[PDB]
Amino acid sequence: EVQVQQSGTVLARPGASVKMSCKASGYTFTNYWMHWIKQRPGQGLEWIGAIYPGNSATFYNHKFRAKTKLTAVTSTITAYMELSSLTNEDSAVYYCTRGGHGYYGDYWGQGASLTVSSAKTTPPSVYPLAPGMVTLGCLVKGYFPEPVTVTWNSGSLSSGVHTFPAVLQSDLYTLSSSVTVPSSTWPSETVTCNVAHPASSTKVDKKIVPR
């Protein structure tokens, strides 16, 4: 039907430049505007600008004019946004949306994540979280980049698991996961979290031991 396909995840260093792109499907590219939206972690949404491929009219947010170049190739039905002189404040999910008269985005692309960081690939330090039903946890601390996958007892413990979203602390991520099991069950039944960090082929298992 209408589809707005976006490019994937970008990892960039401070000072660099990136080019992100959006392909149209299901409509006449030339008759509509392509707008770009920035969504910060929690800083709401900000409109970056818009381009009309039919005549390449562009509109820009004043705040972003100095570092953004918006373009479109009609032959390829693709719009591009180039961002320059990146700083960690440009880390956000960017969306391209389809617009027209009186509106900027009836159909939305899926979002392309950009992280700007000078950090290096760092493996997680995994720590067991014992109390001393009972809730056990694993702290997965200090890894870069995303993601890590956490399982409990090699996937056999799937009920009662909560894995929380990562926070950035200093310039590395920290994440935790918990599992709740019947009291009787622990310690007789061994509970282990298994943490994989693909970028550094880190795989580590941590058995939870009562304190």
């Binding site: 707008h35 009186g102 009836d106």
Partner: protein
């Protein structure tokens, strides 16, 4: 430039009508501001809902309508469905910029409210060995999904060193969030009581531990 203001959170039950408003710091919203409403559902799923003050976007249910009520733009959902639980943003075309409001979290009560299960974990030995100490507070199974988390070290409010995640939807449609207090092992040793206080629907839950 101009500031666009929306309610921060509204709650309704299935089948009721609820109205969300969007206003500008220049006084009135007009037709020339082309008020837009979009919906944000989990995992960055956005849907256009209303464009140009009152046009439903393609395939939006007729229970969604946009109007200007007085000097404000407003979105009304007549007969709210459990699936309308989402964040709603309005934006206004002003000075050739689309300017966004901060969004309204709408809870549409499709199940009973549930209080948070809070769990506070102490630092592990292995981490204290690195000269760091991180306390972990997990908050799960709360519904509505809006909570505030406060940390106290020997009764004093903590203002630096804690991190809290935004509430994520559990698969059972309740919500979960975690908070971290990070200190050096040195500092952790100068204090005895540690508290994670979570307020949800005007009630506080406190989990406290003592270094010792």
């Amino acid at each position: 430039q101009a500031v666009v203001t929306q309610e921060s959170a509204l709650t309704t039950s299935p089948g009721e009508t609820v109205t969300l408003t969007c206003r500008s710091s220049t006084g009135t919203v007009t037709s020339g501001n082309h008020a837009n409403w979009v919906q944000e559902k989990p995992d960055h799923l956005f849907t256009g809902l209303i464009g140009d003050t009152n046009n439903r976007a393609p395939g939006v249910p007729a229970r969604f309508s946009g109007s200007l009520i007085g000097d404000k733009a407003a979105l009304t959902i007549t007969g709210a469905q459990p699936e309308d639980e989402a964040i709603y943003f309005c934006a206004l075309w002003c000075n050739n910029h689309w300017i966004f409001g901060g969004g309204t979290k709408l809870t549409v009560l499709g199940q009973p409210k549930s209080s948070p299960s809070v769990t506070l974990f102490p630092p592990s030995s292995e981490e204290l060995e690195t000269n760091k100490a991180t306390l972990v507070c997990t908050i799960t199974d709360f519904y509505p999904g809006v909570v505030t988390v406060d940390w106290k070290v020997d009764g004093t409010p903590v203002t630096q060193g804690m991190e809290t995640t935004q509430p994520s939807k559990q698969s059972n449609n309740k919500y979960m969030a975690s908070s971290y207090l990070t200190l050096t092992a040195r500092a952790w040793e100068r204090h005895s009581s540690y508290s994670c206080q979570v307020t949800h629907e005007g009630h506080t839950v406190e989990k406290s531990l003592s270094r010792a």
